Amino acid sequence: MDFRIGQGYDVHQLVPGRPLIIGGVTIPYERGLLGHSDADVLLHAITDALFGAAALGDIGRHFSADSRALLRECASRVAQAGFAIRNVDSTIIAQAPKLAPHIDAMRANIAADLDLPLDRVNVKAKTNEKLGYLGRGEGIEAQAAALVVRE
Amino acid sequence: MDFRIGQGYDVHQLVPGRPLIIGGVTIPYERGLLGHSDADVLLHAITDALFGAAALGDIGRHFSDTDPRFKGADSRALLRECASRVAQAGFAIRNVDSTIIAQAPKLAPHIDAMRANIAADLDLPLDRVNVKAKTNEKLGYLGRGEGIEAQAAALVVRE
Amino acid sequence: MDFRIGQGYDVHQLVPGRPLIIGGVTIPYERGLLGHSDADVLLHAITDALFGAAALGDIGRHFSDTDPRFKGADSRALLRECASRVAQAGFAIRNVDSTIIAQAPKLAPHIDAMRANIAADLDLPLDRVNVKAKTNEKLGYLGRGEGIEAQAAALVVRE
Ligand SMILES: Nc1ccn([C@@H]2O[C@H](CO)[C@@H](O)[C@H]2O)c(=O)n1
Ligand SMILES: Nc1ccn([C@@H]2O[C@H](CO)[C@@H](O)[C@H]2O)c(=O)n1
Ligand SMILES: Nc1ccn([C@@H]2O[C@H](CO)[C@@H](O)[C@H]2O)c(=O)n1
Ligand SMILES: O=Cc1csc(-c2cccnc2)n1
Ligand SMILES: Oc1ccc(-n2ccnc2)cc1
Ligand SMILES: [Cl-]
Ligand SMILES: [K+]
Ligand SMILES: [Zn+2]
Ligand SMILES: [Zn+2]
Ligand SMILES: [Zn+2]
């Protein structure tokens, strides 16, 4: 039937003085992401991918509240435009800290916010092999892909 | 149904003495994108996503500087030709999504015009075309305003 | 039908004294990619996109660098095992698209061979596999030839 794809990108600076929150999970680290609220780079990328699949513009056009509430509101808008979410996949690029321990928590948060079965939500983690601002630990990036169907 | 997905990436340097053209829209700005044609980074990324989804290779394999048909061609003519070759391969386009990463200028006022241009070029309804924008939070070459990147995703179906 | 999409990213440093192996192809070059495995940036990205489409985590979850077999590992053997697990999870692969970003060497002469390797490893026909190449238009650590990046997208369907 009427499938659509969306894609998302986000990046925030990594500096001392803020908590590190990614996919709704507070992760221990000497530094944190700089941004408007929680600065949750993963949730922002996913939100963008969903708005994009629905052809509803982008996160800034809707939301001029933490990133989970934003994600839930995004999902309601996608629903009203006539779309059902089929799956989400994503990558976090961070040289440090280790994210693997926290992946299931992020997945659970995202699945809850999107009203999706856990097996339709995935989060992957990558380093930048010490290259660039990412590899020097100066920022963290997230990428997201979402598939939806008009129902 | 025989669905396929494609993904595209492009980046160009921002240089003095050239117009800034993104998604077919000329945007007032002191610098423009450097490339063999208008260097429309967004249209190029979408073009690569469509060639990718149809397993037709990539933009540099289709469009040569050398080829008389495409020498003086702008990126919208190339996007139209891409759509032609996708159709020739037996595919129909279902939707396009994309992100422009530019620290500056402000792209918001231009995005609906970009969508309209892409939709016309691809013979798609407006509600199957999407364009998003992001800054790079002052990080790296994008954050320093040295270039602008575009990312695209395309879904097609073999009919 | 129960379609799912996945995406993948990888990057490795380019260093002297290593084979340059991308898409399973040994490319003549004075430098190669640095990793604990054979460091095949394209196959790793594709592997992550396939695990991601199946919601099976990521390549590090599946192939531990603590396994003696990881050192110098043939990333095509890893991709085939990835495909095996994706199948075991109940998914059939519908298509793959990808981009390699490298200042050098020229990848064009090797791309069809990469596509054939990926197609063989995933038991797909050639017409469902695509590999695209880009330079980074001289920007950043990729423009300086310090590393090579790969991006991938995969579509699967749960049978
Ligand atoms: N160069 C840029 C970058 C971003 N934007 C818009 O700002 C909002 C927050 O990213 C988003 O709504 C985005 O569209 C913009 O107008 N120009
Ligand atoms: N390192 C690279 C980068 C790009 N290319 C090929 O050049 C054309 C323009 O990106 C594209 O056709 C691309 O495939 C290449 O052969 N080697
Ligand atoms: N910041 C990061 C980066 C990566 N990873 C995990 O380590 C594996 C190899 O990079 C990756 O495949 C991923 O499993 C992690 O846990 N935290
Ligand atoms: O999942 C186990 C594992 C870790 S490395 C590995 C492997 C390495 C080389 C060839 N075939 C397999 N297998
Ligand atoms: O267990 C691992 C470790 C590193 C890996 N990797 C880093 C960059 N590319 C693959 C993959 C799997
Ligand atoms: Cl490796
Ligand atoms: K990037
Ligand atoms: Zn953000
Ligand atoms: Zn271009
Ligand atoms: Zn790798």
Side-chain angles (χ1 to χ4, degrees), chain C residues 111-130:
Chain C
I111 292 280
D112 291 344
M114 300 180 187
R115 173 195 214 183
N117 286 343
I118 293 155
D121 290 340
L122 303 182
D123 195 26
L124 290 171
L126 293 178
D127 58 273
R128 288 172 181 274
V129 176
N130 200 70

mmCIF file with all atom_site columns, all heavy atoms in Angstrom, chain C residues 111-130:
data_model
loop_
_atom_site.group_PDB
_atom_site.id
_atom_site.type_symbol
_atom_site.label_atom_id
_atom_site.label_alt_id
_atom_site.label_comp_id
_atom_site.label_asym_id
_atom_site.label_entity_id
_atom_site.label_seq_id
_atom_site.pdbx_PDB_ins_code
_atom_site.Cartn_x
_atom_site.Cartn_y
_atom_site.Cartn_z
_atom_site.occupancy
_atom_site.B_iso_or_equiv
_atom_site.pdbx_formal_charge
_atom_site.auth_seq_id
_atom_site.auth_comp_id
_atom_site.auth_asym_id
_atom_site.auth_atom_id
_atom_site.pdbx_PDB_model_num
ATOM 1   N N   . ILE C 1 111 ? 33.657 -0.199  -8.457  1.00 0.00 ? 111 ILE C N   1
ATOM 2   C CA  . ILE C 1 111 ? 32.304 -0.195  -7.920  1.00 0.00 ? 111 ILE C CA  1
ATOM 3   C C   . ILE C 1 111 ? 31.476 -1.402  -8.373  1.00 0.00 ? 111 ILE C C   1
ATOM 4   O O   . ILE C 1 111 ? 30.757 -1.975  -7.558  1.00 0.00 ? 111 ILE C O   1
ATOM 5   C CB  . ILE C 1 111 ? 31.573 1.133   -8.279  1.00 0.00 ? 111 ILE C CB  1
ATOM 6   C CG1 . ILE C 1 111 ? 32.210 2.318   -7.528  1.00 0.00 ? 111 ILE C CG1 1
ATOM 7   C CG2 . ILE C 1 111 ? 30.051 1.011   -8.019  1.00 0.00 ? 111 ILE C CG2 1
ATOM 8   C CD1 . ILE C 1 111 ? 31.794 2.487   -6.132  1.00 0.00 ? 111 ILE C CD1 1
ATOM 9   N N   . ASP C 1 112 ? 31.565 -1.793  -9.650  1.00 0.00 ? 112 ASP C N   1
ATOM 10  C CA  . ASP C 1 112 ? 30.753 -2.939  -10.115 1.00 0.00 ? 112 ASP C CA  1
ATOM 11  C C   . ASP C 1 112 ? 31.165 -4.219  -9.386  1.00 0.00 ? 112 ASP C C   1
ATOM 12  O O   . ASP C 1 112 ? 30.332 -5.054  -9.038  1.00 0.00 ? 112 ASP C O   1
ATOM 13  C CB  . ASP C 1 112 ? 30.841 -3.161  -11.642 1.00 0.00 ? 112 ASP C CB  1
ATOM 14  C CG  . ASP C 1 112 ? 30.153 -2.061  -12.466 1.00 0.00 ? 112 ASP C CG  1
ATOM 15  O OD1 . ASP C 1 112 ? 29.350 -1.273  -11.925 1.00 0.00 ? 112 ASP C OD1 1
ATOM 16  O OD2 . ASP C 1 112 ? 30.437 -1.995  -13.693 1.00 0.00 ? 112 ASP C OD2 1
ATOM 17  N N   . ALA C 1 113 ? 32.471 -4.379  -9.163  1.00 0.00 ? 113 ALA C N   1
ATOM 18  C CA  . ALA C 1 113 ? 32.957 -5.526  -8.397  1.00 0.00 ? 113 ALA C CA  1
ATOM 19  C C   . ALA C 1 113 ? 32.442 -5.544  -6.956  1.00 0.00 ? 113 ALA C C   1
ATOM 20  O O   . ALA C 1 113 ? 32.129 -6.609  -6.408  1.00 0.00 ? 113 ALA C O   1
ATOM 21  C CB  . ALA C 1 113 ? 34.499 -5.554  -8.440  1.00 0.00 ? 113 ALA C CB  1
ATOM 22  N N   . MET C 1 114 ? 32.375 -4.372  -6.311  1.00 0.00 ? 114 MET C N   1
ATOM 23  C CA  . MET C 1 114 ? 31.797 -4.257  -4.959  1.00 0.00 ? 114 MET C CA  1
ATOM 24  C C   . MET C 1 114 ? 30.341 -4.684  -4.971  1.00 0.00 ? 114 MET C C   1
ATOM 25  O O   . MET C 1 114 ? 29.894 -5.451  -4.110  1.00 0.00 ? 114 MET C O   1
ATOM 26  C CB  . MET C 1 114 ? 31.889 -2.828  -4.428  1.00 0.00 ? 114 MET C CB  1
ATOM 27  C CG  . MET C 1 114 ? 33.319 -2.302  -4.323  1.00 0.00 ? 114 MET C CG  1
ATOM 28  S SD  . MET C 1 114 ? 33.184 -0.606  -3.681  1.00 0.00 ? 114 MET C SD  1
ATOM 29  C CE  . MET C 1 114 ? 34.911 -0.085  -3.813  1.00 0.00 ? 114 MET C CE  1
ATOM 30  N N   . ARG C 1 115 ? 29.591 -4.152  -5.933  1.00 0.00 ? 115 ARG C N   1
ATOM 31  C CA  . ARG C 1 115 ? 28.181 -4.490  -6.077  1.00 0.00 ? 115 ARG C CA  1
ATOM 32  C C   . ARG C 1 115 ? 27.991 -6.002  -6.239  1.00 0.00 ? 115 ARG C C   1
ATOM 33  O O   . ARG C 1 115 ? 27.122 -6.582  -5.581  1.00 0.00 ? 115 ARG C O   1
ATOM 34  C CB  . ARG C 1 115 ? 27.596 -3.734  -7.276  1.00 0.00 ? 115 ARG C CB  1
ATOM 35  C CG  . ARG C 1 115 ? 26.207 -4.124  -7.605  1.00 0.00 ? 115 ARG C CG  1
ATOM 36  C CD  . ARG C 1 115 ? 25.896 -3.614  -8.972  1.00 0.00 ? 115 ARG C CD  1
ATOM 37  N NE  . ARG C 1 115 ? 24.499 -3.237  -9.068  1.00 0.00 ? 115 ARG C NE  1
ATOM 38  C CZ  . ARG C 1 115 ? 23.925 -2.807  -10.178 1.00 0.00 ? 115 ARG C CZ  1
ATOM 39  N NH1 . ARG C 1 115 ? 24.649 -2.689  -11.296 1.00 0.00 ? 115 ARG C NH1 1
ATOM 40  N NH2 . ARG C 1 115 ? 22.638 -2.491  -10.160 1.00 0.00 ? 115 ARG C NH2 1
ATOM 41  N N   . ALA C 1 116 ? 28.809 -6.637  -7.093  1.00 0.00 ? 116 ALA C N   1
ATOM 42  C CA  . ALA C 1 116 ? 28.755 -8.088  -7.258  1.00 0.00 ? 116 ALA C CA  1
ATOM 43  C C   . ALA C 1 116 ? 29.062 -8.855  -5.967  1.00 0.00 ? 116 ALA C C   1
ATOM 44  O O   . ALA C 1 116 ? 28.445 -9.873  -5.690  1.00 0.00 ? 116 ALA C O   1
ATOM 45  C CB  . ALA C 1 116 ? 29.702 -8.533  -8.375  1.00 0.00 ? 116 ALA C CB  1
ATOM 46  N N   . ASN C 1 117 ? 30.027 -8.374  -5.186  1.00 0.00 ? 117 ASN C N   1
ATOM 47  C CA  . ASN C 1 117 ? 30.334 -9.047  -3.926  1.00 0.00 ? 117 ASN C CA  1
ATOM 48  C C   . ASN C 1 117 ? 29.170 -8.975  -2.953  1.00 0.00 ? 117 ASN C C   1
ATOM 49  O O   . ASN C 1 117 ? 28.813 -9.987  -2.300  1.00 0.00 ? 117 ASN C O   1
ATOM 50  C CB  . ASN C 1 117 ? 31.563 -8.424  -3.263  1.00 0.00 ? 117 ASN C CB  1
ATOM 51  C CG  . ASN C 1 117 ? 32.860 -8.800  -3.969  1.00 0.00 ? 117 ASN C CG  1
ATOM 52  O OD1 . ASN C 1 117 ? 32.904 -9.764  -4.750  1.00 0.00 ? 117 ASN C OD1 1
ATOM 53  N ND2 . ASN C 1 117 ? 33.923 -8.030  -3.705  1.00 0.00 ? 117 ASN C ND2 1
ATOM 54  N N   . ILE C 1 118 ? 28.586 -7.785  -2.845  1.00 0.00 ? 118 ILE C N   1
ATOM 55  C CA  . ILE C 1 118 ? 27.480 -7.575  -1.906  1.00 0.00 ? 118 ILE C CA  1
ATOM 56  C C   . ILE C 1 118 ? 26.295 -8.423  -2.346  1.00 0.00 ? 118 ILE C C   1
ATOM 57  O O   . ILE C 1 118 ? 25.657 -9.100  -1.527  1.00 0.00 ? 118 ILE C O   1
ATOM 58  C CB  . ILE C 1 118 ? 27.119 -6.092  -1.802  1.00 0.00 ? 118 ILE C CB  1
ATOM 59  C CG1 . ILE C 1 118 ? 28.276 -5.312  -1.151  1.00 0.00 ? 118 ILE C CG1 1
ATOM 60  C CG2 . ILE C 1 118 ? 25.827 -5.882  -0.988  1.00 0.00 ? 118 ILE C CG2 1
ATOM 61  C CD1 . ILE C 1 118 ? 28.286 -3.841  -1.547  1.00 0.00 ? 118 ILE C CD1 1
ATOM 62  N N   . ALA C 1 119 ? 26.001 -8.406  -3.643  1.00 0.00 ? 119 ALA C N   1
ATOM 63  C CA  . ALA C 1 119 ? 24.912 -9.226  -4.181  1.00 0.00 ? 119 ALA C CA  1
ATOM 64  C C   . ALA C 1 119 ? 25.092 -10.726 -3.894  1.00 0.00 ? 119 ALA C C   1
ATOM 65  O O   . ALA C 1 119 ? 24.166 -11.390 -3.423  1.00 0.00 ? 119 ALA C O   1
ATOM 66  C CB  . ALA C 1 119 ? 24.722 -8.969  -5.697  1.00 0.00 ? 119 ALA C CB  1
ATOM 67  N N   . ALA C 1 120 ? 26.300 -11.230 -4.108  1.00 0.00 ? 120 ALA C N   1
ATOM 68  C CA  . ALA C 1 120 ? 26.614 -12.622 -3.790  1.00 0.00 ? 120 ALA C CA  1
ATOM 69  C C   . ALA C 1 120 ? 26.411 -12.928 -2.299  1.00 0.00 ? 120 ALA C C   1
ATOM 70  O O   . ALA C 1 120 ? 25.769 -13.929 -1.952  1.00 0.00 ? 120 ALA C O   1
ATOM 71  C CB  . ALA C 1 120 ? 28.043 -12.970 -4.225  1.00 0.00 ? 120 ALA C CB  1
ATOM 72  N N   . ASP C 1 121 ? 26.923 -12.049 -1.437  1.00 0.00 ? 121 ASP C N   1
ATOM 73  C CA  . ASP C 1 121 ? 26.874 -12.268 0.000   1.00 0.00 ? 121 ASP C CA  1
ATOM 74  C C   . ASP C 1 121 ? 25.439 -12.247 0.524   1.00 0.00 ? 121 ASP C C   1
ATOM 75  O O   . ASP C 1 121 ? 25.115 -12.966 1.460   1.00 0.00 ? 121 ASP C O   1
ATOM 76  C CB  . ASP C 1 121 ? 27.718 -11.230 0.738   1.00 0.00 ? 121 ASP C CB  1
ATOM 77  C CG  . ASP C 1 121 ? 29.215 -11.435 0.499   1.00 0.00 ? 121 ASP C CG  1
ATOM 78  O OD1 . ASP C 1 121 ? 29.596 -12.569 0.091   1.00 0.00 ? 121 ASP C OD1 1
ATOM 79  O OD2 . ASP C 1 121 ? 29.988 -10.471 0.739   1.00 0.00 ? 121 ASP C OD2 1
ATOM 80  N N   . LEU C 1 122 ? 24.589 -11.444 -0.105  1.00 0.00 ? 122 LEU C N   1
ATOM 81  C CA  . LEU C 1 122 ? 23.202 -11.320 0.348   1.00 0.00 ? 122 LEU C CA  1
ATOM 82  C C   . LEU C 1 122 ? 22.218 -12.175 -0.445  1.00 0.00 ? 122 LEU C C   1
ATOM 83  O O   . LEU C 1 122 ? 21.010 -12.116 -0.199  1.00 0.00 ? 122 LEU C O   1
ATOM 84  C CB  . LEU C 1 122 ? 22.774 -9.848  0.284   1.00 0.00 ? 122 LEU C CB  1
ATOM 85  C CG  . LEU C 1 122 ? 23.642 -8.886  1.093   1.00 0.00 ? 122 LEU C CG  1
ATOM 86  C CD1 . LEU C 1 122 ? 23.047 -7.508  0.950   1.00 0.00 ? 122 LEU C CD1 1
ATOM 87  C CD2 . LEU C 1 122 ? 23.686 -9.327  2.568   1.00 0.00 ? 122 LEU C CD2 1
ATOM 88  N N   . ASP C 1 123 ? 22.743 -12.994 -1.359  1.00 0.00 ? 123 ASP C N   1
ATOM 89  C CA  . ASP C 1 123 ? 21.926 -13.790 -2.282  1.00 0.00 ? 123 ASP C CA  1
ATOM 90  C C   . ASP C 1 123 ? 20.864 -12.937 -2.982  1.00 0.00 ? 123 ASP C C   1
ATOM 91  O O   . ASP C 1 123 ? 19.685 -13.322 -3.076  1.00 0.00 ? 123 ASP C O   1
ATOM 92  C CB  . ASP C 1 123 ? 21.286 -14.981 -1.566  1.00 0.00 ? 123 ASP C CB  1
ATOM 93  C CG  . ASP C 1 123 ? 20.743 -16.023 -2.535  1.00 0.00 ? 123 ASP C CG  1
ATOM 94  O OD1 . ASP C 1 123 ? 21.233 -16.132 -3.697  1.00 0.00 ? 123 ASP C OD1 1
ATOM 95  O OD2 . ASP C 1 123 ? 19.824 -16.747 -2.108  1.00 0.00 ? 123 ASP C OD2 1
ATOM 96  N N   . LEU C 1 124 ? 21.304 -11.789 -3.487  1.00 0.00 ? 124 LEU C N   1
ATOM 97  C CA  . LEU C 1 124 ? 20.442 -10.901 -4.270  1.00 0.00 ? 124 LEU C CA  1
ATOM 98  C C   . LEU C 1 124 ? 20.929 -10.835 -5.712  1.00 0.00 ? 124 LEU C C   1
ATOM 99  O O   . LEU C 1 124 ? 22.135 -10.995 -5.974  1.00 0.00 ? 124 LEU C O   1
ATOM 100 C CB  . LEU C 1 124 ? 20.497 -9.484  -3.703  1.00 0.00 ? 124 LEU C CB  1
ATOM 101 C CG  . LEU C 1 124 ? 19.837 -9.280  -2.336  1.00 0.00 ? 124 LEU C CG  1
ATOM 102 C CD1 . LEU C 1 124 ? 20.184 -7.885  -1.846  1.00 0.00 ? 124 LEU C CD1 1
ATOM 103 C CD2 . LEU C 1 124 ? 18.328 -9.488  -2.430  1.00 0.00 ? 124 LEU C CD2 1
ATOM 104 N N   . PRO C 1 125 ? 20.003 -10.564 -6.647  1.00 0.00 ? 125 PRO C N   1
ATOM 105 C CA  . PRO C 1 125 ? 20.461 -10.204 -7.986  1.00 0.00 ? 125 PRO C CA  1
ATOM 106 C C   . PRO C 1 125 ? 21.133 -8.837  -7.970  1.00 0.00 ? 125 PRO C C   1
ATOM 107 O O   . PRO C 1 125 ? 20.887 -8.031  -7.064  1.00 0.00 ? 125 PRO C O   1
ATOM 108 C CB  . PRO C 1 125 ? 19.163 -10.134 -8.796  1.00 0.00 ? 125 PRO C CB  1
ATOM 109 C CG  . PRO C 1 125 ? 18.133 -9.808  -7.826  1.00 0.00 ? 125 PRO C CG  1
ATOM 110 C CD  . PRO C 1 125 ? 18.539 -10.476 -6.523  1.00 0.00 ? 125 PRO C CD  1
ATOM 111 N N   . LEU C 1 126 ? 21.967 -8.578  -8.968  1.00 0.00 ? 126 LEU C N   1
ATOM 112 C CA  . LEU C 1 126 ? 22.673 -7.303  -9.052  1.00 0.00 ? 126 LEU C CA  1
ATOM 113 C C   . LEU C 1 126 ? 21.752 -6.084  -9.030  1.00 0.00 ? 126 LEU C C   1
ATOM 114 O O   . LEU C 1 126 ? 22.128 -5.037  -8.489  1.00 0.00 ? 126 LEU C O   1
ATOM 115 C CB  . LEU C 1 126 ? 23.508 -7.233  -10.330 1.00 0.00 ? 126 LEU C CB  1
ATOM 116 C CG  . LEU C 1 126 ? 24.702 -8.163  -10.484 1.00 0.00 ? 126 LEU C CG  1
ATOM 117 C CD1 . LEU C 1 126 ? 25.323 -7.928  -11.859 1.00 0.00 ? 126 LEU C CD1 1
ATOM 118 C CD2 . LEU C 1 126 ? 25.743 -7.873  -9.376  1.00 0.00 ? 126 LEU C CD2 1
ATOM 119 N N   . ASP C 1 127 ? 20.575 -6.219  -9.633  1.00 0.00 ? 127 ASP C N   1
ATOM 120 C CA  . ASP C 1 127 ? 19.625 -5.126  -9.788  1.00 0.00 ? 127 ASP C CA  1
ATOM 121 C C   . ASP C 1 127 ? 18.924 -4.720  -8.486  1.00 0.00 ? 127 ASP C C   1
ATOM 122 O O   . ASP C 1 127 ? 18.077 -3.821  -8.485  1.00 0.00 ? 127 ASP C O   1
ATOM 123 C CB  . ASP C 1 127 ? 18.583 -5.508  -10.853 1.00 0.00 ? 127 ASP C CB  1
ATOM 124 C CG  . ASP C 1 127 ? 17.837 -6.775  -10.497 1.00 0.00 ? 127 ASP C CG  1
ATOM 125 O OD1 . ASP C 1 127 ? 18.320 -7.873  -10.840 1.00 0.00 ? 127 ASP C OD1 1
ATOM 126 O OD2 . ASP C 1 127 ? 16.767 -6.685  -9.874  1.00 0.00 ? 127 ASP C OD2 1
ATOM 127 N N   . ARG C 1 128 ? 19.274 -5.381  -7.371  1.00 0.00 ? 128 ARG C N   1
ATOM 128 C CA  . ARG C 1 128 ? 18.763 -4.968  -6.048  1.00 0.00 ? 128 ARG C CA  1
ATOM 129 C C   . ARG C 1 128 ? 19.863 -4.431  -5.147  1.00 0.00 ? 128 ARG C C   1
ATOM 130 O O   . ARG C 1 128 ? 19.657 -4.223  -3.943  1.00 0.00 ? 128 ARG C O   1
ATOM 131 C CB  . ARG C 1 128 ? 18.044 -6.122  -5.348  1.00 0.00 ? 128 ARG C CB  1
ATOM 132 C CG  . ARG C 1 128 ? 16.697 -6.429  -5.988  1.00 0.00 ? 128 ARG C CG  1
ATOM 133 C CD  . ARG C 1 128 ? 16.061 -7.706  -5.409  1.00 0.00 ? 128 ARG C CD  1
ATOM 134 N NE  . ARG C 1 128 ? 14.779 -7.952  -6.075  1.00 0.00 ? 128 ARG C NE  1
ATOM 135 C CZ  . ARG C 1 128 ? 13.622 -7.419  -5.693  1.00 0.00 ? 128 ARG C CZ  1
ATOM 136 N NH1 . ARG C 1 128 ? 13.569 -6.627  -4.618  1.00 0.00 ? 128 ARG C NH1 1
ATOM 137 N NH2 . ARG C 1 128 ? 12.519 -7.676  -6.391  1.00 0.00 ? 128 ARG C NH2 1
ATOM 138 N N   . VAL C 1 129 ? 21.047 -4.218  -5.720  1.00 0.00 ? 129 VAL C N   1
ATOM 139 C CA  . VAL C 1 129 ? 22.182 -3.706  -4.952  1.00 0.00 ? 129 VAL C CA  1
ATOM 140 C C   . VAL C 1 129 ? 22.782 -2.484  -5.636  1.00 0.00 ? 129 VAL C C   1
ATOM 141 O O   . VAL C 1 129 ? 23.045 -2.512  -6.850  1.00 0.00 ? 129 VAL C O   1
ATOM 142 C CB  . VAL C 1 129 ? 23.278 -4.815  -4.809  1.00 0.00 ? 129 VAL C CB  1
ATOM 143 C CG1 . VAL C 1 129 ? 24.524 -4.297  -4.091  1.00 0.00 ? 129 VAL C CG1 1
ATOM 144 C CG2 . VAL C 1 129 ? 22.721 -6.034  -4.062  1.00 0.00 ? 129 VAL C CG2 1
ATOM 145 N N   . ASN C 1 130 ? 23.075 -1.433  -4.869  1.00 0.00 ? 130 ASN C N   1
ATOM 146 C CA  . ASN C 1 130 ? 23.655 -0.225  -5.463  1.00 0.00 ? 130 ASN C CA  1
ATOM 147 C C   . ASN C 1 130 ? 24.734 0.347   -4.576  1.00 0.00 ? 130 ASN C C   1
ATOM 148 O O   . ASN C 1 130 ? 24.570 0.384   -3.342  1.00 0.00 ? 130 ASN C O   1
ATOM 149 C CB  . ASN C 1 130 ? 22.565 0.849   -5.662  1.00 0.00 ? 130 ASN C CB  1
ATOM 150 C CG  . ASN C 1 130 ? 22.966 1.890   -6.668  1.00 0.00 ? 130 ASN C CG  1
ATOM 151 O OD1 . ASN C 1 130 ? 23.052 1.598   -7.883  1.00 0.00 ? 130 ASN C OD1 1
ATOM 152 N ND2 . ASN C 1 130 ? 23.227 3.107   -6.192  1.00 0.00 ? 130 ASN C ND2 1
#
